[PDB]
Amino acid sequence: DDESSKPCCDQCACTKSNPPQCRCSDMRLNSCHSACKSCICALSYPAQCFCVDITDFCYEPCKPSEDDKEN
């Protein structure tokens, strides 16, 4: 029922490694969620944040619900 916490992604990227490394949702103009143990955040306005946590599959794009939304 809590599909709002489901981890997602936006800007995905992988580093040359073996296995390859992969961090995503690099920057955030607000804050993170419950999928970044090592998240950095600057309590300011406009707020600033980052997620250095890494995975091996790069989560899937965000913006649940239908498909696109803005464009």
Curated annotation (Swiss-Prot):
GO cellular component, one term: extracellular region
Coiled-coil residues: none
Keywords: Disulfide bond, Protease inhibitor, Serine protease inhibitor, Signal
Top-rank lineage group of the source organism: Eukaryota
Marked site positions, Reactive bond for chymotrypsin: L43, S44
Protein family: Belongs to the Bowman-Birk serine protease inhibitor family.
Function (record text): Inhibitor of trypsin and of chymotrypsin.
Entry protein name: Bowman-Birk type proteinase inhibitor
